[PDB]
Structure 1
Amino acid sequence: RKKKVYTTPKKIKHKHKKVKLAVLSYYKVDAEGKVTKLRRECSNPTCGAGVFLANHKDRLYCGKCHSVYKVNA
């Protein structure tokens, strides 16, 4: 060997380990009524209306199926 200068530009950007968020499972809350659901789910063959949908800018995700389910209004 000759040397190790570690020449390359410094790009140490080891990521965020999905930062612990605050209280979750915000379906909706209803004063003396039954709660509807924000973040529409999915008409799948497996997912039994338990998985929500990300609300992005002009698309809706899945999370566990990583497939967009958006349809026109």
Structure 2
Amino acid sequence: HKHKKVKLAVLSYYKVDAEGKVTKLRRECSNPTGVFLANHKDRLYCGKCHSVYKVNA
């Protein structure tokens, strides 16, 4: 009754030697707990914004 907790490695971060610099799109925003979140269907899961969250991507 939970996520399978599969051996998930780092996601949304492609490589470090990707011909040849580090390639991590979605430049660091004010959401540090940067970090990658859930997209369900044109939505994002509010994870750190306890007060205000006005952004859509």
TM-score w.r.t. the length of structure 2 is 0.34
Q: Which has the larger radius of gyration?
A: 1
TM-score w.r.t. the length of structure 1 is 0.32
Ranked by relative contact order (alpha carbons within 8 Å, sequence separation 6 or more), the top structure is 2
Structure 1: give runs of 5+ residues left out of the alignment.
1-13
Distance 1:22 1:43 in 2: 23
Aligned residues: 57
Task: Flag as ranges the 4+ runs of structure 1 deviating above 6 A.
Answer: none
Structure 2: give runs of 5+ residues left out of the alignment.
none
For the aligned residue pairs, the C-alpha RMSD in angstroms reads 4.6
Distance 1:45 1:26 in 2: 15
